[PDB]
């Protein structure tokens, strides 16, 4: 890519990506329940799914 | 040839073992004859797997000692090689026959231990291990801070020990054990 970082620096930077989700959401979406997410990778489209108990909130 | 095996150039036959008690743990004859005293190993995995290890191998293994020398089996192979080539030019006989008589005339028969120490006999394997011990620690001292090289001091040890001249370190430290054990029993 543009900076073309190695896979070591690519996996762990996207491993830090997961860890910052599972802290950002537990500090906001905790009053409505939170049970982790599942990030899904596609080209030019990155869909994440917030698995939580109270979807109507 | 696959018939006769030489220690490089030293013969392996015609070395009779004088002790019937000690001939069990001296691997030098007709099956344990190797060109070099440097085998791969596989001798410290059973209790008596040390027994069929060749006695010439045990001598080099009993030499790398005191720090710096530990782990250097090549140079003690060269040491014992140079040491052997001295004995045939100093006694005129085969070096192995000297080494056989070196072990036999240095091993303490009795040894005292805590049970007021009861003197008790030794096993022949312990008598071998102490024999290769004493005529190695005596050559390390006679070579230390001395112009006389270790390949020379090793020769002088087992030459004096093979006749029991009561001047070799292995001989003096052996008679003391057999004296103190004779004392308290």
């Amino acid at each position: 890519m543009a900076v073309q970082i190695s896979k070591k620096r690519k996996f762990v930077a996207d491993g830090i990506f997961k860890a910052e989700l599972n802290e950002f959401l537990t500090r906001e979406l905790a009053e409505d329940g939170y049970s982790g997410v599942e990030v899904r990778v596609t080209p030019t489209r990155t869909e994440i799914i917030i698995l939580a108990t109270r979807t109507q909130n | 040839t696959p018939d006769i095996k030489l220690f490089g150039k030293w013969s392996t036959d015609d070395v009779q073992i004088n002790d019937i008690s000690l001939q069990d743990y001296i691997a030098v004859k007709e099956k344990y004859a190797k060109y070099l005293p440097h085998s791969a190993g596989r001798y410290a995995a059973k209790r008596f797997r040390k027994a069929q290890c060749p006695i010439v191998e045990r001598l080099t293994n009993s030499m790398m000692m005191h720090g710096r020398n530990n782990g250097k089996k090549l140079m003690t192979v060269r040491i014992v090689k140079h040491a052997f080539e001295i004995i045939h030019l100093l006694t005129g006989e085969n070096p192995l026959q000297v080494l056989v008589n070196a072990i036999i005339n240095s091993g303490p028969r009795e040894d005292s231990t805590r049970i007021r120490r009861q003197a008790v006999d030794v096993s022949p394997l312990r008598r071998v291990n102490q024999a290769i011990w004493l005529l190695c620690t005596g050559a390390r001292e006679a070579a230390f801070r001395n112009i006389k090289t270790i390949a020379e001091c090793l020769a002088d040890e087992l030459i004096n020990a093979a006749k029991g001249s009561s001047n070799s370190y292995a001989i003096k430290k052996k008679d003391e054990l057999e004296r103190v054990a004779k004392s308290n029993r």
Binding site: - | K31, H38, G41, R42, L74
Partner: protein, 142 residues
């Protein structure tokens, strides 16, 4: 004509020796240099084991080459020994009878159990809290 080649291997601590049997005359050399010109010369008769336990006439019609990398000095020496001693026993198993393969195996059995079976000893890993695999750093009271 047809190629009677066998590529027999042999390992040690890390030193791996892959030999290469062939039909022809008898030449025995590793990496381009013969076994009478291999350092350390303190161990020359280890490289001469399968030619003195079997005789120079066994490798008469067989020419062998060995490529070796890795390991250390002594480890390479034992690597070359259980490559060409295993090379002749596998060459004498595919192209001739095993009455001539067992008659060379049993001599290599009774002399040393390393020319045929590798040594499985590998260097033990280091754990924290010490300098080596088993040794620990010095403990200080008071």
């Amino acid at each position: 004509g047809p190629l009677q080649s066998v590529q027999v291997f042999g390992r040690k601590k890390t030193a791996t020796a892959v030999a290469h049997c062939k039909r022809g005359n008898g030449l025995i050399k590793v990496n381009g240099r013969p076994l009478e010109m291999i350092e350390p010369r303190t161990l020359q008769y280890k490289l001469l084991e399968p030619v003195l336990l079997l005789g120079k006439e066994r490798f008469a019609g067989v020419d062998i080459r060995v490529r070796v990398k890795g390991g250390g000095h002594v480890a390479q020496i034992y690597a070359i020994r259980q490559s060409i001693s295993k090379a002749l026993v596998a060459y004498y198993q595919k192209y001739v009878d095993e009455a001539s393969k067992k008659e060379i195996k049993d001599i290599l059995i009774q002399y040393d159990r390393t020319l045929l079976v590798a040594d499985p000893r590998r260097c033990e890993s280091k754990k924290f809290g010490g300098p080596g695999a088993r040794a620990r750093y010095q403990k200080s009271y008071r």
